[PDB]
Amino acid sequence: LGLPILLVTAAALIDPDGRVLLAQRPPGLWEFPGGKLEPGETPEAALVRELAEELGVDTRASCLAPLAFASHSYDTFHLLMPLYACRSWRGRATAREGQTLAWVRAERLREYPMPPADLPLIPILQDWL
Amino acid sequence: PILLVTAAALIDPDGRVLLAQRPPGKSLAGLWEFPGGKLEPGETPEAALVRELAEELGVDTRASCLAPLAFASHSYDTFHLLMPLYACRSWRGRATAREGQTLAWVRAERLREYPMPPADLPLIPILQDWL
Numbered sequence: 001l002g003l004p005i006l007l008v009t010a011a012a013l014i015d016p017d018g019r020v021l022l023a024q025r026p027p028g029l030w031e032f033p034g035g036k037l038e039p040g041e042t043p044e045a046a047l048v049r050e051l052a053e054e055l056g057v058d059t060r061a062s063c064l065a066p067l068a069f070a071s072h073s074y075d076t077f078h079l080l081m082p083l084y085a086c087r088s089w090r091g092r093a094t095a096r097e098g099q100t101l102a103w104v105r106a107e108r109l110r111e112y113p114m115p116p117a118d119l120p121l122i123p124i125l126q127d128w129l
Numbered sequence: 130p131i132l133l134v135t136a137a138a139l140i141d142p143d144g145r146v147l148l149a150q151r152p153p154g155k156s157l158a159g160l161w162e163f164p165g166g167k168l169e170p171g172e173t174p175e176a177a178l179v180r181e182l183a184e185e186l187g188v189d190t191r192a193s194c195l196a197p198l199a200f201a202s203h204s205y206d207t208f209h210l211l212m213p214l215y216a217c218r219s220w221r222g223r224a225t226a227r228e229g230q231t232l233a234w235v236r237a238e239r240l241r242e243y244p245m246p247p248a249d250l251p252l253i254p255i256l257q258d259w260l
């Protein structure tokens with residue numbers, strides 16, 4: 001059964017040390033920061049404001065380098081989720097939306113329970129890092 | 130507005146990857162590109178690629194043979210291209226140009242010899258590593 005595509009952006013902020021930023025969903029699993037797209041927005045632009053909204057992070061669409069993507073079918077929509085790698089941003093990441101953050105080293109990634117759709121991105125992130 | 134396109138990287142047993150040259154005289158006429166195309170209503174990007182590989186090359190594969198490899202995201206003048214790329218090592222039938230296009234099985238190091246749209250260009254290193 002044909003379903004609509006839902007585009008969700010994902011950023012992997014990466015430390016000068018190589019730790020990747022992960023965000024846990026507030027009560028009421030870990031995932032990459034990002035979110036749904038909005039009209040007019042390039043995906044790079046939707047990520048740039050979600051990074052500011054969610055983390056207080058300030059970066060340029062040009063600092064966002066395409067890395068990989070997740071593609072997964074749910075019941076009412078198929079998820080397509082491009083993951084961007086970001087090594088340069090201004091300000092330090094703070095949980096503005098009541099979430100808990102975590103900078104985790106490539107190897108400890110599998111210690112973080114993620115939504116099943118995000119799982120395939122982990123091996124890819126590791127090989128990259 | 131966003132335009133979604135799905136590209137496949139067919140790899141044969143000997144490491145070569147298939148490129149298809151756009152014909153005259155459509156957008157980006159003589160440039161080489163990874164086979165694929167627009168998605169139709171209700172299609173998963175995988176399903177679109179399955180249909181596309183069949184129409185374009187008479188190549189028959191399944192969704193589960195498609196490995197998320199990377200994506201291109203380029204700003205063009207009228208639309209913004211978001212283009213997921215999948216690796217594919219397993220398909221039935223020999224790849225044959227059905228839509229006019231000219232084909233090339235290129236060894237990874239020679240990927241540079243083939244001019245592509247500027248949007249596909251970042252995909253090459255990501256492909257070279259993967260291989």
Ligand SMILES: Nc1ncnc2c1ncn2[C@@H]1O[C@H](COP(=O)(O)OP(=O)(O)O)[C@@H](O)[C@H]1O
Nearest residue numbers: 134136155156162163165166167210246248249
């Ligand atoms: N590597 C690519 N493969 C397919 N389409 C691409 C690619 N790179 C950019 N595009 C753009 O996306 C559109 C997809 O091509 P196509 O589906 O055949 O529409 P058209 O009939 O105008 O060629 C193109 O128009 C093209 O400009």
